[PDB]
Structure formats: structure tokens, C-alpha cells
């Protein structure tokens, strides 16, 4: 055909962390929350099948799957780590997913609490009509 298409979607990855007033019985000093979302409340569920958060092996059931929004994990712990996040798409064509190695860093006690936002742009060259339609609803 004469025509060609490039579709771009915006994803916001982020996390917040605070030192607890009292640590847990396991010795967890921090509460944190990590998320994947669309910018400005945009509904990425139109094209996102699921988000998988791969937590550190020290956590129980470390593969945390969010099939619906909000795509987030709320936890307590004692240290930060690299947290692989997989965003699966509602498609039957490649790419089926994208991976981000998310930097789930925690600040030291007596430092300001963490509140981080990471901006990612996905580009899809010539997606299927069905997948294009899902992307442009978001």
C-alpha cells in the first residue's frame, strides 16, 4: 500500500518510598509503592494486557501480576533493587511485550523520601488495524 503508520504511546513508571516510624517484625524499615500508568489519567488498559513486576527473590511470590489497573505493587522492605517490569500488549503480533529494568531505589534514614517518575515512549511502526485501534484509544 501507499500508506504507512507510526503510533506512539506514553507510559509513566514510578515509585514512592518512606522510612517507617517503626520497623516491621521482619526488620523492614521502608514502605514503598511502584507503578506503571498512562500520563494524565489516560487509560492504557485499552492496549495493555497485563503488567508483571518481578520483585527481588527475598519477597514471597516475587512475580506480581496486575491484569487490570491500577498496575502497582505496595510493599515493605529494607533495601532497594533493580525491578524488571514487563508490560504485555493486547495483540497477536510482535512485539507482544516490552521490558524495563526499573531502579527501585530507597533513600537512607534522615534523607528526603523518594518520589520518582520515569517517562517512557513506546513506538509501534505499522501495527495491525486492531492493535492500532487499541493504541489510539489511550
Amino acid at each position: 500500500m501507499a500508506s504507512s503508520c507510526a503510533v506512539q504511546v506514553k507510559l509513566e513508571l514510578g515509585h514512592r518510598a518512606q522510612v517507617r516510624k517503626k520497623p516491621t517484625v521482619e526488620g523492614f524499615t521502608h514502605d514503598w509503592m511502584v507503578f506503571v500508568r498512562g500520563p494524565e489519567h489516560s487509560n492504557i488498559q485499552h492496549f495493555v494486557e497485563k503488567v508483571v513486576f518481578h520483585l527481588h527473590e527475598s519477597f514471597p511470590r516475587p512475580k506480581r501480576v496486575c491484569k487490570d489497573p491500577p498496575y502497582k505493587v505496595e510493599e515493605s522492605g529494607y533495601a532497594g533493587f533493580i525491578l524488571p517490569i514487563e508490560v504485555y500488549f493486547k495483540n497477536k503480533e510482535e512485539p507482544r511485550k516490552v521490558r524495563f529494568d526499573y531502579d527501585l531505589f530507597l533513600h537512607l534514614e534522615g534523607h528526603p523520601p523518594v518520589n520518582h517518575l520515569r517517562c517512557e515512549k513506546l513506538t509501534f511502526n505499522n501495527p495491525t488495524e486492531d492493535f492500532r485501534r487499541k493504541l489510539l484509544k489511550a
Partner: peptide, 9 residues
């Protein structure tokens, strides 16, 4: 691999 958990950026 091991000892990847840490504090600070």
C-alpha cells in the same frame, strides 16, 4: 547477582 539489595541511589 548476589547482594544486589542496597540503600541510596
Amino acid at each position: 547477582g548476589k547482594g544486589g539489595k542496597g540503600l541510596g541511589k
